[PDB]
Amino acid sequence: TEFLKPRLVDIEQVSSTHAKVTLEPLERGFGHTLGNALRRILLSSMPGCAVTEVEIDGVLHEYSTKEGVQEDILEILLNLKGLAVRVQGKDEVILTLNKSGIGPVTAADITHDGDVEIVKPQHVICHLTDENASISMRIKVQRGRGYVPASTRPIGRLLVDACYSPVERIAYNVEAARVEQRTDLDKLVIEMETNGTIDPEEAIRRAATILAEQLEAFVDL
């Protein structure tokens, strides 16, 4: 009559966004119990950063156009919505972008800053087609969790929908194992696919902490 407490045995990183985490050893009937709860917590409660306000000097609203840029303002906002950033010790930060001349205006054009980190510099925001044309934007980045619509939340400030969740796909599996000559045990393998913002072990530990904090209340008093 002894329970074996699982431990995180190794971490594998196939790519910069696809990772695999293995927990071992687990008792019979506990692999699914842990996996489903971990998936439901990870897919909905992970914190992250996103874009909430974008301000361009030469525009007034989203349904307008600027000379020299191929895309509309709406498509520029839709491209900025997908930006992946990391912030270390600040809740809200301001980023500036300035460009001139023909070329793809991408994420690497953002002014380099000490604490803000960019994950995919090759992500494209817009295109410039005229030599004399130039673009300058300011971006506000906050921190939070969940999906916060703009409607729920000075002329020239454009509000964009915020998707704070940094996790895109979770897939767990339970496999047979032979740990200590006990055939009842098994191992749990979790595959995470994110945008490259949150480290796998930190996310797993945060999910476990959330579930334990929620479980604290079930000591009846």
Partner: peptide
Amino acid sequence: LRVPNGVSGTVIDVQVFTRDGVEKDKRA
């Protein structure tokens, strides 16, 4: 008072027409 009920958006275009002879005032 003039924007109706619950629909809410952004003003994207404003056109003005005045009767001929009368001089345009202010914004027009």
